[PDB]
Structures are given as structure tokens and as C-alpha cells.
Amino acid sequence: MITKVTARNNKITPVELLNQKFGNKINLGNFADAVFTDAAFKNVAGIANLPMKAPVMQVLMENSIVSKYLKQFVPDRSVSFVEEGQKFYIVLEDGQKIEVPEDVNKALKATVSDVKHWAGYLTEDGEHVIDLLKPAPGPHFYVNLLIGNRLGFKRTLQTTPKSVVDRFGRGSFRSHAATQVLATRFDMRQEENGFPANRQFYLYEDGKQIFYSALIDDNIVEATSKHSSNRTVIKYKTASNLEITRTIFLVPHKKGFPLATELQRIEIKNASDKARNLSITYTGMFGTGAVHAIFEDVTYTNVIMQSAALYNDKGEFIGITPDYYPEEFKQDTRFVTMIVRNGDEKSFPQSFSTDYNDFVGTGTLEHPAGGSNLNNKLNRKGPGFFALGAPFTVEPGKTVIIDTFTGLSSSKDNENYSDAVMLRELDNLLRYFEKSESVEETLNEIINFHENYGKYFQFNTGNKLFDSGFNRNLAFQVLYQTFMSRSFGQTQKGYREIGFREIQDLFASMYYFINIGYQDFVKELLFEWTANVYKMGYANHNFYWVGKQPGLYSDDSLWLLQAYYRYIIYTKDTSVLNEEVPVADGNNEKRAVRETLKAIIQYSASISVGDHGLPLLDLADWNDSLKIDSNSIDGATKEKLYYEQLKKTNGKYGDRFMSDYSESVMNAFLLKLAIDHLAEIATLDNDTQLAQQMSELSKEVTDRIQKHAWKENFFARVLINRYKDGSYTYLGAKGDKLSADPNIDGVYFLNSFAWSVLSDVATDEQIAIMVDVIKKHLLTPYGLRLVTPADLNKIANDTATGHYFFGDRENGAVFKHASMMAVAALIKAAKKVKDNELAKEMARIAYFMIDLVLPYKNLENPFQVAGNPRISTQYINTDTGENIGPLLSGTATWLNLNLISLAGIEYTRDGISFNPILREEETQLNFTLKAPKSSYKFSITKPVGFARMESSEYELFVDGQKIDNTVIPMYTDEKEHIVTLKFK
Amino acid sequence: MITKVTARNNKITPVELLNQKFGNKINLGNFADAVFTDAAFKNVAGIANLPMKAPVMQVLMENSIVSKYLKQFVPDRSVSFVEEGQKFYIVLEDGQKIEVPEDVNKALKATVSDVKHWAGYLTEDGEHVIDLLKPAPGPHFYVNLLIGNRLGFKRTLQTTPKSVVDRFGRGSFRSHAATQVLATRFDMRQEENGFPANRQFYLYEDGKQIFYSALIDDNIVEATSKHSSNRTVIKYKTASNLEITRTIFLVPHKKGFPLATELQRIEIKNASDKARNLSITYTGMFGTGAVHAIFEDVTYTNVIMQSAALYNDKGEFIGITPDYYPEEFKQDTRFVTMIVRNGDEKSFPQSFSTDYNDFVGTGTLEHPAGGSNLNNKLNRKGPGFFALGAPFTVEPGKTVIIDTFTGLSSSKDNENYSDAVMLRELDNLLRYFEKSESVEETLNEIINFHENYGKYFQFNTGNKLFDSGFNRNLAFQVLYQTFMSRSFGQTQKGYREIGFREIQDLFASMYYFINIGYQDFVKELLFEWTANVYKMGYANHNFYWVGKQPGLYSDDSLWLLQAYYRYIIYTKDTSVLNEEVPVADGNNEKRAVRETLKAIIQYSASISVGDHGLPLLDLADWNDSLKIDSNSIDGATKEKLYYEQLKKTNGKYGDRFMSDYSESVMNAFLLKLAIDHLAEIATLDNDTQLAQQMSELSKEVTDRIQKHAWKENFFARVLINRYKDGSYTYLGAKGDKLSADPNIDGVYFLNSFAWSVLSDVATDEQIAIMVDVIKKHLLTPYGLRLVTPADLNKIANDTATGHYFFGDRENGAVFKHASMMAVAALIKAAKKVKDNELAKEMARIAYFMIDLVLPYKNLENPFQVAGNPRISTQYINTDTGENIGPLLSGTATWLNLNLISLAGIEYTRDGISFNPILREEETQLNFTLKAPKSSYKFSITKPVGFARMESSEYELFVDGQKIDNTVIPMYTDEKEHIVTLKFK
Ligand SMILES: OC[C@H]1O[C@@H](O[C@H]2[C@H](O)[C@@H](O)[C@H](O[C@H]3[C@H](O)[C@@H](O)[C@H](O)O[C@@H]3CO)O[C@@H]2CO)[C@H](O)[C@@H](O)[C@@H]1O
Ligand SMILES: OC[C@H]1O[C@@H](O[C@H]2[C@H](O)[C@@H](O)[C@H](O[C@H]3[C@H](O)[C@@H](O)[C@H](O)O[C@@H]3CO)O[C@@H]2CO)[C@H](O)[C@@H](O)[C@@H]1O
Ligand SMILES: [Cl-]
Ligand SMILES: [Cl-]
Ligand SMILES: [Cl-]
Ligand SMILES: [Cl-]
Ligand SMILES: [Cl-]
């Protein structure tokens, strides 16, 4: 009877039908655009020969002239526009080619003129300049992320403020945890991160609205946004020649300031020849303290608060705070205030409103009926809407500056807390920013801070999009993730705690912090993670103010050894091993770091091991889909059962916990690497007993992995111990019986390869075999997928049926973080394997995958690949090529590590092991490197083709002297050293 | 330094300052309005002599002419408008009185002309006619609630669809449980129940937007909404003489239909002399199946679905369905479709869009840039936005009708479910509604159904607002609550299950259902609740598809005896006692209803009792604030401990569970009443042993209550057993030591009074004493508060600090449900106490409180009292007098019972015990009453003053014969009986 046609099973696309109908009467070029003319998809209207994919038909249909013209033909007749000799025609299927009227021609020419820049462009410094009218490639593309600075202050991870800002300034602003200053929105669209009023304002003249910052109409003749490092600047010009500029940034902390302040400076320049009598109404919505009640009891959120007015020492109104009745919502205190600077005069708002209904009245948010006559009524209820009003006359050629300060004070940074604390901190803030120039000086301080931070590693290549993308944008993102982990963004809006394994972000950022004088901060972070390890050696899976989920995931603790290794090898500071740090078990017990690292290794190498002596998988490891064991236990439960086991079987602590639980081969690799790291740390610390014990244990673990986890053509991913008849014994290689793809024998996990190499277990022949499998079955046109198709229902009855269409997340996506771990392995192997042809191939795959993750390349074909050209995104949809959010992800961290690795830098016992792997087409690579007490200029030259030190002739010079030792010293002479490498 | 002034701490109001500055130069009358002119509140602009409180200054300030005129004086000078001799002046503080210009005079006159009706008015049939421009008193005031009809089909409570509709048609639409058809919004404002596009549409002409159903601009010359019983009709007239009418209702179920369908009919009449070529774009937003992910993972909500197009047998597009990948979201299937009826022609949509971003484009939702050129693109992702487009030419004087059908099919009503089921049900629906007249016939069927349902009890007084308010509006609300409990509304948006104690709704509705032939449905509901009682006698606190929270709250089971009593006494159907009903414990065990009722009584009378033999309080009872015992246990835990106790101490089942837990006196009253009810049921069932046992137990329980719970001047509320030194021993009367008000000795709970009377425990002297306490300490200007101020931290030695400002919810509100239980007691006592002066006073309090809850009276002073003039609201804020939502509440149920009781109707063993209690100023009361096999016309006459049968002379006649027996027979002769009562 009735039939259903889904988006995906729709049989033909508009552009395909356009080609079918017109592809032999006109040249459709390499790119075209088209729309179906009716809901049965029988006819199309399109346009030929575009420079890239873009929604041109949509923009044309918004044009009254072209839309009316098309109605002469559509829907009954298909049509294509075509340009010949710089004039436009419309072509019909019956052959006719009609020269379109002049007004249609002008509209078509204007529309196609700059299609290649419709998603914006990057400045030389890597800043994204966006047109406020153009369509968005996707909901993360036009987004900037802002952060405060709590370095030098307490609990930096938990207290640094953070904000998200789209091209219109939309978004939200948080203090500690998920505490909302400006309101988040949890609604249907990814595009709506915040309440729509946030950061927006109106201008009035003669009682009539002339401007709204989130409405572009015909009275706006220019409107652009620029996303830069830690600030966004939005500019408009009206037809009446008002020039409006918004600058948004977070205030770096200073003693006595509120815990969170966001500054928005608005500059209004009268570029006309007549004075104008204007007024501003600045609006927003405070976040509720009662977030769960938005879902559960909206009336509660309203009745528990009221608005309150703030007055300075002269009795002048300065702004609004939402005042709460319940004590639990009085431990933070929000505020908004504004200063109007008009020539000599400084003024504060003359009126306000605090009730959204009274403000909008009979109008809309874009055209509010009460916006020009604020009612000065303090709302007895929430929500905490605010509007602040002030008049100003602006003379010809002159500018008025309005500085807004939005923020929160908190008990999280102040003992004996009450709203009196907020009032004092707000006074301190406003006094600091009393002089107009103070805002500019703070912005310059922010700019200079991030510029200085980035100097640890600077590329200088022929490609300024790459150089700025790495030197500024990626460096900023890695700082951002060190402070924020995975806890905030455009679509990351729920409360998220810090995952233990996300210590990974510090793997990349620690060098940057050390080289701006914050080595102690790095140590503090190491110790903070260490305090989340239990005596037995498992870890809290998550923490924020305190830790939770003891030993729930089996991989967590092992990552901490990589962090300590990187820190100790770089700095040679073994003193951290003697630090007495609280154990996660509490009471009031502390343990030296060295003993905690030993315990981590013992847990995974000896206690929590399965029948093959490899680490147990438990609930899951790094991969949350490996819910193979449905009766798994956490570390606290395991600890209790273990002690009962020792008592019942007369065992000794350190003996194996006996079970038929499955084993994680990825954890085995993480462990082997961790053991190697501790052996090397111990040697540096002159701890001969520990070095020897760890060296021998590494050999033993390596033997277990080789004997029990190499399965013909790959390292397995999981060993299965509960089927004593052999029905299933492993997952992750040929013969595992678990493939869901009839054309693939076995399931293959990218991380089995990656971690077998990163841990230095895989032999050269094993690498060659695995790379062959990867090329055949894991390498897609959009990069390296995480795993091939698996049918885990055969062993994990528990198993979730799928949630995703093909291409998204677990149904076949390219997870870019995992792809970057695999690239790290490809790079490491390409430097060392004996066979130069294997090395060359692995480096080709490495650069192919890097090219698919570099954010700036998202502007090459933005309406297909989307993403964000300054900030990583999490995955590539393998059906469409679209880069899909969220923004914060391990991709950025590992991309940073990988590009530095390819440039040749690895820190080792005796200095910098230098071994660069350039692109085949590159003939030069230059970069600078900072160290704590010296600096370096590196220059590499080669002919076209694959070159590497292992197999190619070369000459290496340091400070003008030819040298054979490729381990460059870590100099401490406070001089710049010149390193030159020439491949012959 | 900086100071803070809250809404509540603000010293003086605008109107107070207006009177201070002007009150003896002009007559400000009984009502005025004013606004502060600046943020320091020094000056005011106001207007004198309004007919009621209303936001007149706000509306005047939206008027460009008046706003500009005021700027000649404000902000520096205070002003008041005044009308004298039908012309307006503005008065200044210096005494100047200036005749305002003619254009300002016209604007002021027009604005004040109809202030008395700014919040709308009620038709004679109780329908609320609302102006779409006027401000709202509050966020529940302009709301209607719609319901489907699943009578005669399975799982009626769980499957009846329901919708909320404001005056603009905003809101949302649900199927079973919290399953969203059209999307709910969980955001900052109580006003936003749904995604803003829901139910809204646009009209176009020559490619330009001429109308949006949720935008009133100057091209709209009339715009009104009418909320009636189970439908809303919204009407507009454009300046171009288009007349647009929207009619929204839910389709009653028919076999083969989808489980939920909402019909919106749009009629467009061309009342001009020229044909118009128009088009409509009909929009909305499907709700997500993944509601939790709106908060947790918005990207997930998008990627798990895609849009899909629907086609009829002829290959014509008919509408859209959102298609889901995960199996858990494929068990419901949503749809939207539309039919355009233009003269002889019927047509389906010619175009669609399914991507909000493409639809809005560079515009706004009110003015979407893609609305006139839908792109016919099926979105690969959610959210499930839809727009359906169709053209039509409408000739002069003619009408085009667009019928939209939005809905969902579900596995909850169909075995072997898939989307094929939806397609078949949608086909059935569209075939049924093929002919234009079918929509009108279905609407008339709905209207007639509710009119017939209401005939159980009809008032005929001189007061059509009261008569329609009761006969139509309250009757509908009580039906609504029987099907929906407390689970849906404007601000009730989270998932809520059916509370066991909300069987109370059936106390009022059962008589209505029985008198339309649905006695079997009433029995089925009795059995459904009965299946949520455990063998031991405690109950699941909540249920929906299954029950949960076994015995968590101590009162729950006792309410079931009231439902069985009302049913059995009305119908004399004792057969229900023999029904074998599943026990809540499961394991396929059943028990006869009679034995379950016995078990309920045994649990509260013998097992779960404290040191005084009164029922234990447990976590809490009816009052969720009585968290007195911090180590309480649920019934499952108690059952386990009880059996352990019996074994340890060699006890027998039925012995007391031993503890120092506190006792609930309200539960003791509910129990005493329950026992009396079972004794009477048993006597009717000729079960002499059970009747004797219950009669004796009632005496025993009464003695326990009198001996241990009467405390000098009140029945206590809780007896406390854990302080053996006597430090605290009770809560709820003089001497309890728990008052938080230094001027009150004791805490007094309204329900201690109410239930002491409803259970026939309180003596006449106890009633006199308690009513004196109530008058002194519980009766406020806004009605009966629930409790006086208490300091429970002294015994719950640390429970929650308060959450509310004074006046709201637990901080002193008038909870209208509890107020109506107290009124039930006052009425019962007024009928029977010996002292006529006590009776008179109690009846005065009863009618005072009724007047404060009757919805239609919310239109007397609507901008102060708000509420909703057709639907109850939950509480009155005792600081402001505002009636605050939610809408569904026990208020409506008990208001219905109380008004019928006051009219004199109580069903007893031998018929109708007739004992009416009229208002003192009433001289007449007439009403009709339906019974299953007869009907009645009642007429009561009296002189002015208090009259009642107990104390006043009267003559009673039935069918023209004077009778002395005031128990009127329940006649079964299928005749109308005339009952006349004349007080002398
Ligand atoms: O519905 C039962 C009772 O509700 C009480 O209001 C409660 C709110 O509904 C509830 O949301 C809130 O609980 C949280 C809130 O959800 C969360 O956002 C915030 O972080 O903490 C709040 C702490 O409670 O609690 C209140 C009060 O308990 C009504 O007061 C009551 O009438 C009603 O029976
Ligand atoms: O965050 C860890 C993993 O998340 C996975 O997506 C999950 C969604 O975030 C989660 O919302 C969903 O769970 C619910 C959903 O919350 C609720 O609305 C609905 O009723 O049921 C959903 C069923 O689960 O689950 C998915 C995963 O199943 C990512 O897939 C994964 O990459 C990530 O590690
Ligand atoms: Cl171009
Ligand atoms: Cl994000
Ligand atoms: Cl993995
Ligand atoms: Cl509600
Ligand atoms: Cl109570």
C-alpha cells in the first residue's frame, strides 16, 4: 500500500540525475550542484562547473530574482544553468539553450564568483575568517574554543574557565566542572550549544531597533567573524555606516578576581558625517544552578531564584546577579556588568530588564518589543535573563566602547564563602579594568602567552597553512586538552570527569609547559594522577575533585608509566620517584611514587592475569566495545576476592588471581612498554635491583605475548579462556571465527598492530605481515578504520545490537585518535626496520593518514569533509568522508607527537635521537626546537624520493662539525645550536 | 563596596512610589500601574484608575507614539497619566497637568478601553477566548490539555495519547509513557514545552511569506484562540482579508489506527474579491527516541536516524517518517502527512524539506529563507525536522482545507512489530479521513462524548461560569487525570509513572465512567492497582507497565480500600471480592481481592506498627517531607527482617515487626477508615465473620489513636519512639517542641484535622478545638496552608535546609489538594456536628477555600492570581496570591467530590444520604444526577442565612410525596425522580 524511501536507499542523487539529463549537451565540469524539483524526485534544477562541492542551488533559491525565474520551468521541466563566455544560459532537456535575463545573469555571476571561499579562509597566522551569511559545512566548523588561565593557582584542571563561541558569538561559558555561567542549551540541534540570547545585543536609534548582533539583514553590508587563538572578533558594517566590532575572550586569573570572567568588548564607530543618538541593550541568560531540574522540574528552577541588582559605592547601578534560596546553589555567585566609554565620559547602565517575557513582549528575540524601554523590574523568579541598557551619542568619526564582564565567583576558590566574596572580587575586577587600555593590554597578554607557549617547536616550511596549523592551532588545542580533557565543547555539554587514561594529553603538552617555566605544574599533574592509583595497582577510571570507579577498566594505570617516562627521560628528574603521594585507597596512607609504579606493573603482570599470563580485560580496556566478559569485576571487588583466594589456597600476595576471564593483548603491549620504561627509569636512578627485575620481566612478558598472542598473520586483540573445548580461544587474527564479513577471515584491530610496534614486540617480519593485512582490510579511502567487521554475539551474548548506520562511530568509522596511534607505530617502524621498501610504504601510509586529519585541510573540500579548519574532530564517516565532532579528542595529542616524530625528534637516554622521515616530494624541512637551557635550528635537505638514515647516505653536522653520532646532546649552554642533515 | 538588592528586598514598589508622589494631586483609584524609570528606582511613570491590576505601562511602552511622548519627561521626571472627562493628561510632580496630544490620547484611550478582558474571557460553555497579543498572567494560564480515547482497547492508562497546546498551538504530543511524537523542549523557560516549529505553518504568495502561524504582526488584524473541551481553535484575519482557522484535536482510537494521531485542520478562506495563488509550508519537529542523549550525546541523537519519504499506491509523496537504526528506537514509528482540499481537488504535498538548517537558511524560524523553495532532500541525519509544501489557488469567497495527520504506531499495541505495521495503520487512518466531512464528524464525536460523560452531575444555577466550570471543565479534568495521573502537562515533561496513591482520581471519576456504560473499565482499574499489592499488604509506590518501589511509602495500600468502598457501595457489586488477581510478588501467584484487602489492613494494623500500635511512617507517608527516620526500610527489606524476627523470637505471622521506628497518625486515620470500609463491604457481602472482625478492629484502632495521638489541642501527625528519655515524643500538636515559629507552640498539620474527621475519629469537641487552631494558625488570606513552621532538624538531625522563598511549595504555600481534603472534612463535619454555630463556621471556611481554587475565578484578578481559568493548578503562593502550576493535581479530584458533597450527595448502604449545605447568600440550588437505572432532578430552597437539616426546619419531597427518610432510594425504574427540599 504505502511505501517508504529512506535517505540512504533513495536510488539516485540530484547531481546524478542532472548528469543523466544534461551531461552530453553541456560540460558539467568536475563539480556541479542540483536539487530535486519535486517530492517524487523525477526532475532536477542544477548548475554546472563549480570549483568545488557547495550548496549553490540553495543560495540561488534564496535569491528572489533567480527563484522567480526558475518558476517559469520548474517543477515540470528539468533545467541546468551554464556559463559560457562569462554569460549565463539555462538549458532544457529538449535542447533549448536560453540566455537568461540580465538581472538573473548578474545574480548567477555574483553567486558563483567566490564559491571556493564560501566556508571562509585562513589567515597567514591560521585564523579562520568566516562570512556570517554563508552556509556551514557542519555544526563544528564555525566554532572556537576559549580557555582561561589558572597557572600559578590551585586546582588548575578543575577551576580553569572555558567557553565555546560560534561565528555569531553563540554558545556558553563555564566555570569549574559543568558549572554554567551563561546557559547551555540541551535541545534537538547540535548547532545550539547555548541559550540564544547569550552574548548578543541590540542597538536603537529614535526608539527603533537598528541592529541585532545575531541577525544579518539587508541593512548589514559587511559581516565577518575571525576565530583566533583564544579570542574571537566579529565585525559588522551597516548601510548607515556604523562599524561594530565584538571581541570575546576569557580573563586570565589574577589574585582577587572571580573564578570565571568572560569579557566582551563592543566597539561602535560612527563612520558617517552626522552624530547619532544611539542606545545599546546587552542581553544574555545565566545558567541555572539546578541543571537536573531543567529536565525534571522546570518550575523548581524558576522559583528557587530571583534577580538582584548591583550598585557601586556611588549608588550607581552596575549590573545583575541571580540570587538563589537553596544553600547548594549559593556556593557560586554569577554576575554581569557593563561600562560605556564615550570620549571622556564613563557610564554604567541606565536601565535593565530581568524577565524574558516582558523583554520580548509581543515581539521575537530578534525584534523584542520591550528592548528599547527596559522596565527596571527585578524578577521574583528565574530564569536569569538579563538586559542592560545605556544611551550614548557618537559623533562623526568617533567610537564608543562598551565593555561587558560576565562571570562567577565560587567557594571552590574561597573559604568562608558567601555572596560578599563575589562582591569583593567583582570590585577588584572592575577596578583593574577601569582604564580603557587595560582590556587591550590583557588581550595582548593572552596573545603573547600563547605565542610564547608555542615556541617549544616551530615548523618553518613553504606552507604557512601547515606552519600556523601546527605552530599555533594544534599547540593551543593540546594546551586546551591538558586543562579540559574531553569535558567541554560545542556538543560536549554534559558533566564529564577526567578519564585516567587521558593522561595521554600530557604526553604531548608536557614539553610545552616545561619550556615556559612550568615544570612544577607538570610534576603536580603527574602526582595528581598518581593519587588515583590504588595500593594494588589498579586506578580510578575517572576523577575530578575525587576519584571513582576503582579498577573498572583494565588499561588505565599502565598509561601513567608513559607519562613518567616522558617526563624523566626529558628532564632527568628522578626526584619524582621519591615523592610521597596519597594512595587512592584513602584512610590517610601515602606511598612513594616508585612503589606505586612497581604496583601498577605487578597488577597487570602478575596478579590480574589470565591463563596465558597476560593482563585481564575486565569490563573493557582502552576499547569500550570489548564487553566480552559479562560477569567482569572492578578492582575493589577483585581485591576482596583475591585476599579470600590467598587465604583459601594458602597463597602469597603477588600470586595470580585465578579465573577464566579473558585477556587483553593491547594491555599486554601497554604493560611491556611500561616495564621497559620502568627499567630505564630505574637505570637512570641508579637502582640496579629494579632495573634488572624489570629487564627480566620485560623479556618474560614479551615471551608470553609471542607464544600466546601471535596468531599466524597478526597479534590477537583478546585471548578467550572460558571455552575449554576450544570452540573460541582468541579474537583478532586469521582463524578467530569471529568475522562478520564473509570476505575476511579473522577480525583485525588496528591497535594490535600499533601497540605491538610502540612496545617494540613485533619483529620486522611480523610488521611486514601486519602492514599487508592493514593495506588489504583496514585502510579505506578515508583512512585507517579501527577494526574490521566482527560478530561478537557468538561469544558475548551480552552484545549490543548495532546503533549506527554504516560509516558512523562503531559501524566502520575512521576513529582519528586510533588512526594517529597507528601512525605513531608506522613512523617508529619506518625509522628502524631493515627493509627500506617496508619503511617507504609505512611512511606513505603515515602521511596519507596525517593528510586526512590535519585540520587546515578541511578547507580544501569543506562542504564534503566538514570538520573544523583549526581544531581536530573525532572521526571520519567512511560512507561520506565527513569529519564529525566532537572537537576535543586524542587525535590532536597524537597528531602533535607524530609530526614531531616525523621531523626526527625523539628524546632518549643520551639526548635527542634524530631520525627524520620526510615526505617523498619534500626537498627541505626546517624547524626550531627549544630546550630548557638551549635551543636548536634544524635543517634537513634531500633529493626527491624516499630517504631515511637507516638506508640512505647522509652527512650530519652540529655547530658546523660533521658528526657520526645521531644522538644529539641536550645542550645546557644557553646557546642556539645549528643541526644540518643532508641526504645524498 | 558594591551592594546587592534582591527583588524581594527592594524597599518600595513602582505603584507605591506613584501614590507617594501623586496620590493627592490625582485620584489613583483602586488599581494603578507603574514602572521605575531608571535602574536606581528614584522615579516612576504610571497610570491611574485601572479596573484591575494589569501590565498597562508595559503595553503603552510598546506603542511608539506613547513611548516617544514619555521621553520628553522620563527618566529625569516622574509622571502619571490620568483620564478626566474622557480625555488624557500627564501630571508632573510640580503639579503641572498637561493635556496630551491627540495621537497620544487616542493610544491611551484604546489601551485602557478593555483592560478588564486582557487575559481573555469565558464563553457561556466555559471555553477560554484568548487574544494572541495580550500578555500572559503566567505560563499555565493560556494552556489546554488534549487526550485521545482508548476505552474499549488494551492498556488504556499506558497507551492513551496526550497533547499540550498553548494559545499559539505551541507544545508537544505524546503516545505511551513519555514517548514523544512532536518534540518536547527541556530548556530555561516554563513557557517552552515544545520545539518552536511544532504545529506551525507559513503561507506564501508570489514567492513571498505572507503569514506565519506563530507571528502576529501589523498584517494581522484579528487573532484569537479558543480553548474548549478536548480541542483548541485558533483564528486569524489578515489585512488582505484571508481568514485562517486552525483546529487541533487527538483522534479517538479505532481498530487499525496508529496508537497516536493528532489532527490539525487548517481552513483558509479568501474573503477578498480577487483569487489568490498561495502555498502552505507545514512544519514541525519529531521527538527523538533517544531522550537521555539530548543531555548526554546530542550527536548520537542525530546520527542514529535519517529522514524517509512516504508514497501512496499511486506513487504520490504523502509525508515523512524518521527512520532509526537501533532496534530499541524502531519499536515506535512516527509519521506526518497532509491532504489539501481545494474545491473538487484533493492533493498531497508537492515538496518537502527535512533539514532545519537548509529550511531556515540565512533567515529565522519566523522568516525562513528556504520556506518557499523546499529542497526535497531527505536528511541523512536527525533531528527530524519536517516541512511539507503545497500550492493552491483560492477563489473569491472560497475556502481551502488542509488536514494534517501527525502520529506514531507502536509495538505497544501490535505483535510482530515493524515499520510495515505503521504503513498499514497510516493507510487505514488516511482512508478513514478521505472524505472532508469525516474530520468534522470525528470532532463532533469528541464533543458529544465529553458532553455525554459530564451528564452524571449537572449544576443549573444562575452562574454559567460556575456551571460550565464544573459540568464541563472539571469533569473533563477528572477524566484526564484518570487516564494520565500526574504524568503530562505544560511543565510536567519528564517521565513519571503512576503513583499508587493516585487511585484517588478514580474516587471522583468512577461515577462518571459507570454512568456511560464503562463499569467494567472501573473494575479493571481496581484490579490493576490490586495487582500492585504484595502478599504482606504493602504496595508498589509506582507502576506503569510493571510496578516498582515495594512498600517504600507507608500510606499507599490504604487508599485502595477507599476505591473499593466507593465502587461497592455505589454499585452493590461484591463480585469483585472474588476476583483472582496477581500478587505483586510474582511467580505467577494470584490471590482473591478479598484476601488482599485483608492483608492491606493487617500490614498497617498489626505487622508494620510502632510502640503505640499505629502504622509505621517508614521513609514517608502521603507527605514526602516527613523524612523523620533516616534508616527507614522498604517493604521487601522489612519482609525479610520480619521473617528473621519470627524465627529468632519464635513468633507467628501477624505479630508486630519490632522496631523504634516512628508512627504515622495520618496513616492511622487512613487505616481506621479502611477498616470501617471493609466491615461495611463484608456486611454487604454477607460475610459475618469478616464484618465482626473489622468492626472490632476499628474500635481497637480508634482507641489507640485517641489514647496515643490526641495531644491536648490537636491530633498529632507523627509519634516518635526512639527517644526513651522523652526528649521528643510527637510532632503535630501543642507541646511537641518542634515549632520554628516563636509565636506558635506546636506544629499543626492540616491533614491531622482532615483525616481525623474523614475517618470519623474526632469527637465534636475535638473538631471545635482543632477548627479554632486552624483559624488562628493555618488559615491565611489565600487559604489553608498544609502545616505551620517546623524545625525538624531537631530530630532528623540533619535533613535538607530549605529550597524555597516564603510562599512557594514547602515554605508556606497553600497546597490546594490538601486544602480540598480539609474542605472534605469541613463539609462532612458541617453536616453532622451537633453545634450549628460550629457547622456554620466550618461551612464558611469550606466555601472560602473553594472560592480560592475554582478555576474560573482566576479571571477575576488574573494578573495577580494567574493560574488557568479552565484547569486546576497545584498551589497558591502565600506571598503573592499567585496560583502556580502544574495543572494536573489532586485539587481537581477533591474539588469535584467536595462540590457534589455540598450539593448533598453521599452514597450509603440504603441509597443517597441527602444533606445539602448551601451558601448563606444562596436561596436556591438545582442540579441533575444520573444513576445507572434512573435519574434525579434536585431542587433546594432556603431563606438567606445558614441552613442545614441537622438544625433547621425543612420539608423533603420525592416524586411529590412528603417523606421523612433523608436517605433517598437508588431507583432502578428507568424514570426521572423529582426531589424537592424546602428549608423554613
Ligand atoms: O516531586 C516531589 C517533590 O518535588 C520537590 O521539588 C524537588 C525538585 O523537583 C527536584 O528537582 C529537586 O532536586 C534537585 C534538582 O533536581 C537538581 O537540579 C539540583 O541539583 O538539586 C536539587 C536538590 O533537591 O528537589 C526539589 C525539592 O526536594 C517539591 O518541593 C515537592 O513539592 C514535591 O513533592
Ligand atoms: O561515551 C562512550 C561511548 O559512547 C557511545 O555512544 C553512546 C551514547 O553516548 C549513549 O547516549 C547511548 O546510550 C543511550 C542513550 O543515552 C539513550 O538516549 C537511549 O535511550 O539509549 C541509548 C542506548 O545506548 O549509547 C551509545 C553507545 O551505545 C559511542 O558509540 C562510543 O564511541 C563511545 O565510546
Ligand atoms: Cl570561486
Ligand atoms: Cl565539541
Ligand atoms: Cl582496540
Ligand atoms: Cl503542567
Ligand atoms: Cl501531611
Side-chain angles (χ1 to χ4, degrees), chain A residues 496 624-625 800-801 803-804 809-810 815 874, chain B residues 289-294 296-297 300-301 328-329:
Chain A
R496 190 178 299 270
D624 206 22
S625 82
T801 60
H803 284 223
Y804 300 107
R809 295 180 176 183
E810 280 74 31
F815 278 105
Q874 182 187 81
Chain B
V291 177
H292 182 64
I294 292 291
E296 182 187 348
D297 190 350
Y300 178 83
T301 72
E328 66 184 303
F329 305 123

Side-chain angles (χ1 to χ4, degrees), chain B residues 857-925:
Chain B
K857 299 180 68 68
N858 295 168
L859 274 165
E860 290 166 7
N861 173 34
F863 292 97
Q864 177 163 357
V865 309
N868 177 304
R870 300 183 60 261
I871 306 175
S872 76
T873 42
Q874 184 188 79
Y875 76 90
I876 313 182
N877 181 304
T878 46
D879 201 26
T880 66
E882 192 190 356
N883 288 266
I884 306 195
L887 292 158
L888 309 185
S889 117
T891 302
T893 300
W894 286 83
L895 175 63
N896 175 274
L897 295 173
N898 288 342
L899 288 164
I900 294 170
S901 290
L902 283 161
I905 304 301
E906 174 181 17
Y907 301 114
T908 60
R909 178 188 74 198
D910 297 324
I912 302 165
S913 292
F914 180 47
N915 201 342
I917 304 291
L918 273 59
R919 299 183 181 255
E920 293 177 20
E921 70 274 11
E922 281 167 351
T923 56
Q924 186 74 32
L925 177 62

